[PDB]
């Protein structure tokens, strides 16, 4: 098989809330 993805952007920046774009 071909290794997954789902790695996408983000990374690991403050759990106690999200981390996907709070626009300007």
């Amino acid at each position, epitope marked *: 098989r071909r*290794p*997954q993805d*789902v*790695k996408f952007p*983000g*990374g*690991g920046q403050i*759990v*106690g*809330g*999200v*981390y*996907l774009l*709070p626009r300007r």
Partner: antibody, heavy 118, light 114 residues
Framework: QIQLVQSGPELKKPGETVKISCKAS????????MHWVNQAPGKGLNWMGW????????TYADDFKGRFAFSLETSASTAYLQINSLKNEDTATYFC???????????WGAGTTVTVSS | DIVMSQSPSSLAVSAGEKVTMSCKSS????????????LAWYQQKPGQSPKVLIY???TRESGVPDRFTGRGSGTDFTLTISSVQAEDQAVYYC?????????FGAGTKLELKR
């Protein structure tokens, strides 16, 4: 498919120390941090805490302050869980799961059946 | 912090019927930033490890049978299995992430009749 694997169950006597495992194979280990969920017998699930699969740091919850530690040899894809001074109440089944950004657990383990007694 | 509790604590429905169990947070789960309620529900049948069925409260995972249903937002969430197949003899919990530390609900028990 994608799976996480935990050391088998383990028996220990009031006061020991213990180390369970959680080897994952199906995803870039370090590209999702690993959490530990607990579960007594017939009881509910308690959120142990988790290890930043990068930062390689741990965050314990209140009820797992001290005694309970987390670690992971980032390499052989396996994130540890270690305990100290077990107590009778320390008996319970353990877990590790992958936690994405969405905010859930897509894959957990089988869990460690660890129990503590003479 | 976010007290959690689900309800009822059992349910004995019958083949082909619709169920409605609860899970009601404690202190908001609609995260403004996201516009998603960070509620999630998990089904642990006896012995397997739990499995989540829905995320963002309402969103059904890739794999989950169309027949399970996560509604709720803000502070009043609901899970529904129409035509509850047997296999469904499980137990359901729910959790929050909107604020560490994570918390599940005592869990709602789903038995079956027949």
């Amino acid at each position: 498919q994608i799976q996480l694997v935990q050391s088998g169950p383990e028996l220990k006597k009031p006061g020991e120390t213990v180390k369970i495992s959680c080897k994952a194979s199906g995803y870039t280990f370090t590209d999702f941090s690993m959490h530990w969920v607990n579960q007594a017998p017939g009881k509910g699930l308690n959120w142990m805490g988790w290890v930043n699969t990068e930062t390689g740091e741990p965050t314990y919850a209140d009820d797992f302050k001290g005694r309970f530690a987390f670690s992971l040899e980032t390499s052989a894809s396996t994130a540890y869980l270690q305990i100290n001074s077990l107590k009778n109440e320390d008996t319970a089944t353990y877990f590790c799961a992958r936690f994405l950004l969405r905010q859930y657990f897509d894959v957990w383990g089988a869990g460690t059946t660890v129990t503590v007694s003479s | 912090d976010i007290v959690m509790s689900q309800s009822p604590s059992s349910l004995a429905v019958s083949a082909g019927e619709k169920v409605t169990m609860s899970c009601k947070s404690s202190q908001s789960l609609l995260n403004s930033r996201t516009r998603k309620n960070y509620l999630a529900w998990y089904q642990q049948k006896p012995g397997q490890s739990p499995k989540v069925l829905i995320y963002w409260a309402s969103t059904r995972e890739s794999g989950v049978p169309d027949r399970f249903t996560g509604r709720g937002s803000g502070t009043d969430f609901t899970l529904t299995i129409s035509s509850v197949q047997a296999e469904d003899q499980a137990v359901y919990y729910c959790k929050q992430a909107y604020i560490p530390p994570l918390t599940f609900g005592a869990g709602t028990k789903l038995e079956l009749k027949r």
